[PDB]
Every structure is written in C-alpha cells, then in structure tokens.
C-alpha cells in the first residue's frame, strides 16, 4: 500500500495505488549415501552369532 502526498497544480492529481504480489515456492531436495557392507547385515541380523 503506497502512501501519498498532495500537490497543487498545474501538474496533475494522483489517486491511491495498491499492489498485490504472488510468489511461487521454489522447491529443492537433498541426498546422502549411508551404504553398508556385505557381512554387516548378518552381523546385525544374527546369522553369524
């Protein structure tokens, strides 16, 4: 909402202006690598216990 000041002539008269803005979300993602090994499944599961 724009404020106004009031002038005289000869240059013209202004009205109140208004503005309505819309902005779209920009979307991203991330990644990570956790990878395990061969035996480590069976060492957690209990095959080699």
């Amino acid at each position: 909402h724009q404020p106004l000041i009031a002038r005289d002539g000869p240059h013209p008269i202004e009205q109140p202006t208004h503005n309505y803005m819309t902005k779209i979300i920009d979307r991203r993602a991330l990644n990570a690598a956790f990878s395990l090994a061969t035996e480590a499944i069976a060492l957690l599961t209990g095959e080699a216990l």
Partner: protein, 44 residues
C-alpha cells in the same frame, strides 16, 4: 473583521536530533524515510 489567535500548550516528547552550532541549538532532520518514501514525487 479583526480576529486574534488562541493557542494552548500541550507538549509531547518527540524523537528528533539536536545539533549545537555556535551560540544556538539547531534542528537537523533529513526527510526521506518519514516523508517521500515510495512515492512518485521528486525531492525538492
């Protein structure tokens, strides 16, 4: 057709700026953020 002014003191505190120059205190403000911010008006 002759009429005289009537004035009443109602003082309030106002944030401002005071500068001492020479022998008298001098007022100093810039008038950009208070007035003329985001208009189409040139600064005279």
């Amino acid at each position: 057709t002759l009429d005289e002014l009537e004035s009443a003191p109602q003082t309030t505190r106002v944030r401002a700026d005071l500068v001492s120059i020479g022998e008298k205190l001098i007022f100093l403000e810039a008038l950009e953020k208070r007035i003329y911010a985001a208009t189409n008006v040139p600064y005279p």
